[PDB]
Amino acid sequence: PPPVRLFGVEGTYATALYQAAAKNSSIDAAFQSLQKVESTVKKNPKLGHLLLNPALSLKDRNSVIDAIVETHKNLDGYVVNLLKVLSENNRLGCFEKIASDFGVLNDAHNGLLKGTVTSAEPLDPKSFKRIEKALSASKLVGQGKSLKLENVVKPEIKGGLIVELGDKTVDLSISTKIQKLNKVLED
Amino acid sequence: PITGKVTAVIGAIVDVHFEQSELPAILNALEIKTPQGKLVLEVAQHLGENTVRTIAMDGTEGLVRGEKVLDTGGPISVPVGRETLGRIINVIGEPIDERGPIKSKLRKPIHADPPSFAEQSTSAEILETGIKVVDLLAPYARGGKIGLFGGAGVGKTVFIQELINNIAKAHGGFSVFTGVGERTREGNDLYREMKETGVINLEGESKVALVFGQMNEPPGARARVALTGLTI
Amino acid sequence: TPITGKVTAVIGAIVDVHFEQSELPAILNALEIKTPQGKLVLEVAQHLGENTVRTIAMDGTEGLVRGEKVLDTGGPISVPVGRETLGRIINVIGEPIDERGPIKSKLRKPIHADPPSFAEQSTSAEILETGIKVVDLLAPYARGGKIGLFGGAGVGKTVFIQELINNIAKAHGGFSVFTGVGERTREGNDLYREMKETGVINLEGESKVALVFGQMNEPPGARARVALTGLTIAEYFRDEEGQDVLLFIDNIFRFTQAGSEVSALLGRIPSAVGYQPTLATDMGLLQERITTTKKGSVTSVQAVYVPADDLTDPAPATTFAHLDATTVLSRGISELGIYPAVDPLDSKSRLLDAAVVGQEHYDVASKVQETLQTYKSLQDIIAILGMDELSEQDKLTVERARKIQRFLSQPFAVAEVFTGIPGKLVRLKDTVASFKAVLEGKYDNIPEHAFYMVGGIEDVVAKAEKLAA
Amino acid sequence: SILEERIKGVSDEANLNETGRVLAVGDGIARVFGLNNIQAEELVEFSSGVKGMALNLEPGQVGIVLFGSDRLVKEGELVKRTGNIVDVPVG
């Protein structure tokens, strides 16, 4: 059973990878090695970008796979079986997609809460820290998952702040308040 | 030649996955050797991924997904000749008259491109027909299309027979009675009648060559029967 | 707003752009792709996510190269309005296609404009008489109303509208808007020439008419927003100038039709007959942006190309719903040679009432309807067996009705060329009188041919004398 | 590295800017990979020896419409752009 199913298309692949590596026991190893080969795929720019797009054979695809396992002899065998799956399904256009998804499952398994505090401008580090403290203090943190605080800059969200994490947000942006004030003052 | 494994048999639409890069062209004829002799499949699409989609000319009942397929390399090539005169041939261009292998000179693809604008004859003529009624009130025309109406057995068949007789005097040409989804009981009778009226003389010569389509033949083979006849 | 994008797809005239920055225009914003064909104006219609909008293209999309740079104009397309519009033919974009150069702009207004509220409504009650006998008798028009025509387009449909322009719009005076969605370019040129000739457009002087013209050659997508553009011009008059206007729309079937074409490409599951699912909403919105507010009263004339002349078709059907009066014109009545070819048993107005036009008018109309309906009822019997085999009482009715049918033709001066008969306009007061007499059989004693293709009762009397010689 | 070199080795070469290679084909429309710069409603000439007019320009694929019999075209053939919107000699 995965740590909560997420993603259907491509994520059945990710789920499978997760549960299979749960039966491998080593999920972290798998993820780390996948991360490393994925990174060198991205840092292979000629045909590691320009042949991420299927247009070539099953057999040619297989030989690309063979080149990939020459690039790293550490990739476990489950993620080498994942290479087999992707070659067989001839879908390379969702390799990094699967990588991202496996990251989500993996860090859910690790248990790290995710969040973002989108604002109009990058906030103070004191603000960051106070918010980090607050979020950990709040019942939202289960003490089992540790927030990510990602500042996003969104001037379109004119002033204020919006805190986001879980399915729970508090939006005390200036834009929303102005919007509501204006709207009701058009009534 | 190229070979491929059957990867679907949904209806009479049989998808064959062929070895890489070397794939049949559209309108090629494939032969799957069967315990039914052969099954002729005609490639009518490329589905991509080194797979094609074909239609069948013989019933698809029984077929293991993965049977070897062989590509003939082009539209079914049916024997032609004065030999083929007076021979019943099925869609796959093989004798069903049971007068044994038809001695062939050349065989020719069933699909063929219509003659060019240049090759069209620029003035029409009148084809003579012994029937006076025909020659006065609706004259037959050289290379024309003349559409019969009125049910079979009124003498429709006899009218067709008459034309063969007339044709022998008129030109001394040949004919091909192509029967599209002919009722097979009726077809037996027709063969017997044609033999009897001597337009087919088994010992002797035969003007008409027969291509008979049976309603039991797959729809695809019903469709291609006409084109086969035309090639003759 | 300067938002670069690339053209991900060009599936018909429904280009899809993929913005590369995370600032994304909203739905109904407008974008310009600049090309050696100048700007092409596209309008955002879906957000398909991942910073990929899908945009309807209001200009032709041939030659586009995928990945081509886009720039976002932002917000709905803003046409230019004023009184400076009057004396212009304007393209969908707003370009002055009558080539009187740049239109002196006052306020430029977004094409999409929300329909005025329930509170803003003001109900009409005006009588607008066209001097067309069949109109007057059967279904009087009203100032501010929504008038409706159905049948084959420009098979006489266009002519009918032209007759209306000839009569109503000189008397009305003031602002008037002609908006022609997907019309035949040559017919439009004729209208332009004619308007200039009748001085309504006086280009040397001022024009009290403005024109929007969308040719049927214009791409389907362009045709979709020709209508919305015209409505904006009208709104400026309705609201800002606050003077009573006129509006002509021909054909509003083209509006529906255009939508159905784009709908498929857009990716909607086709509704019955193939019409867009948003057919009801789009028609609804359009027809509530044409209305008589307390701000102003806009008489509108809408022309419906009924496809195959089947009223049961869902697009004509939903049109029938939004009109205030209709005068369906039937091909059969055209075959009978009666021009105007308005079906007399398929006309309605909410203005035909015994209060609105009084009991005497209503009584006159009642008898006409009854007589004609009887005549329609006996059509079977007439064909199967002779009229002599009908009852004597019925034979009087039949003879009267045959006369009424012939009487209803009124030569039109705009159709003077085609008819070859000088047109005649007959007063509303005169019309009621004329029919009253005929209904009492006063002048029933003279041939059917006497009633055929001639005007008022007095004219009929004279035409009997003409025939008598 | 050597791996990248071997990948380069099995690659067909060319980014297929202004040329394509045909994918699945049938029912008188073909779906081609490449033709990176492609004018809309252009005339393309296949290596088959037939010409077609690009109709559907879609993300990552272009759907030519075959002006001619399907027998002529076969999968994986190289389509070269005529480079012109469909034109016919006039004079």
Swiss-Prot record, chain A:
GO molecular function: proton-transporting ATP synthase activity, rotational mechanism
Pfam family, one: OSCP
SUPFAM superfamilies named among the record's database cross-references: N-terminal domain of the delta subunit of the F1F0-ATP synthase
Keyword Transit peptide: yes
Cellular component GO terms, alphabetical: mitochondrial inner membrane; mitochondrion; proton-transporting ATP synthase complex
UniProt record, GO biological process: proton motive force-driven ATP synthesis; proton motive force-driven mitochondrial ATP synthesis
Keyword hit for Mitochondrion: yes
Keywords recorded for this protein, A-Z: ATP synthesis, Hydrogen ion transport, Ion transport, Membrane, Mitochondrion, Mitochondrion inner membrane, Transit peptide, Transport
Gene3D superfamilies per UniProt: N-terminal domain of the delta subunit of the F1F0-ATP synthase (1.10.520.20)
General function of this protein: Mitochondrial membrane ATP synthase (F(1)F(0) ATP synthase or Complex V) produces ATP from ADP in the presence of a proton gradient across the membrane which is generated by electron transport complexes of the respiratory chain. F-type ATPases consist of two structural domains, F(1) - containing the extramembraneous catalytic core and F(0) - containing the membrane proton channel, linked together by a central stalk and a peripheral stalk. During catalysis, ATP synthesis in the catalytic domain of F(1) is coupled via a rotary mechanism of the central stalk subunits to proton translocation.
Record text on subunit structure and interactions: F-type ATPases have 2 components, CF(1) - the catalytic core - and CF(0) - the membrane proton channel. CF(1) has five subunits: alpha(3), beta(3), gamma(1), delta(1), epsilon(1). CF(0) has three main subunits: a, b and c.
Family per record: Belongs to the ATPase delta chain family.
UniProt name for this protein: ATP synthase subunit 5, mitochondrial
Species per Swiss-Prot/TrEMBL record: Saccharomyces cerevisiae (strain ATCC 204508 / S288c) (Baker's yeast)
Lineage: Eukaryota, Fungi, Dikarya, Ascomycota, Saccharomycotina
Gene name as annotated: ATP5
Swiss-Prot record, chain C:
UniProt-annotated binding residues for ATP: 151-158
List of residues that carry Phosphoserine: 334
Modified residues (Phosphothreonine): 73, 198
InterPro entries: AAA+_ATPase (IPR003593), ATP-synt_VA_C (IPR055190), ATP_synth_F1_bsu (IPR005722), ATPase_a/bsu_AS (IPR020003), ATPase_alpha/beta_chains (IPR050053), ATPase_F1/V1/A1_a/bsu_N (IPR004100), ATPase_F1/V1/A1_a/bsu_N_sf (IPR036121), ATPase_F1/V1/A1_a/bsu_nucl-bd (IPR000194)
SUPFAM superfamilies linked to this entry: C-terminal domain of alpha and beta subunits of F1 ATP synthase, N-terminal domain of alpha and beta subunits of F1 ATP synthase, P-loop containing nucleoside triphosphate hydrolases
Parts of the chain that traverse the membrane: none
Miscellaneous comment: Present with 164000 molecules/cell in log phase SD medium.
Designated name of the protein: ATP synthase subunit beta, mitochondrial
Source organism of the structure: Saccharomyces cerevisiae (strain ATCC 204508 / S288c)
Swiss-Prot record, chain D:
Domain of life per record: Eukaryota
Subcellular location: Mitochondrion inner membrane
Modified residues (Phosphoserine): 11
Family as reported in the entry's similarity comment: Belongs to the ATPase alpha/beta chains family.
Record note on quaternary structure: F-type ATPases have 2 components, CF(1) - the catalytic core - and CF(0) - the membrane proton channel. CF(1) has five subunits: alpha(3), beta(3), gamma(1), delta(1), epsilon(1). CF(0) has three main subunits: a, b and c.
Described purpose of this protein according to its UniProt entry: Mitochondrial membrane ATP synthase (F(1)F(0) ATP synthase or Complex V) produces ATP from ADP in the presence of a proton gradient across the membrane which is generated by electron transport complexes of the respiratory chain. F-type ATPases consist of two structural domains, F(1) - containing the extramembraneous catalytic core, and F(0) - containing the membrane proton channel, linked together by a central stalk and a peripheral stalk. During catalysis, ATP synthesis in the catalytic domain of F(1) is coupled via a rotary mechanism of the central stalk subunits to proton translocation.
Miscellaneous information on this protein: Present with 41500 molecules/cell in log phase SD medium.
Protein name, entry field: ATP synthase subunit alpha, mitochondrial
Species of the source: Saccharomyces cerevisiae (strain ATCC 204508 / S288c)
Taxonomic lineage of the native organism: Eukaryota, Fungi, Dikarya, Ascomycota, Saccharomycotina
Part of the whole protein covered: 47 to 137 of 545
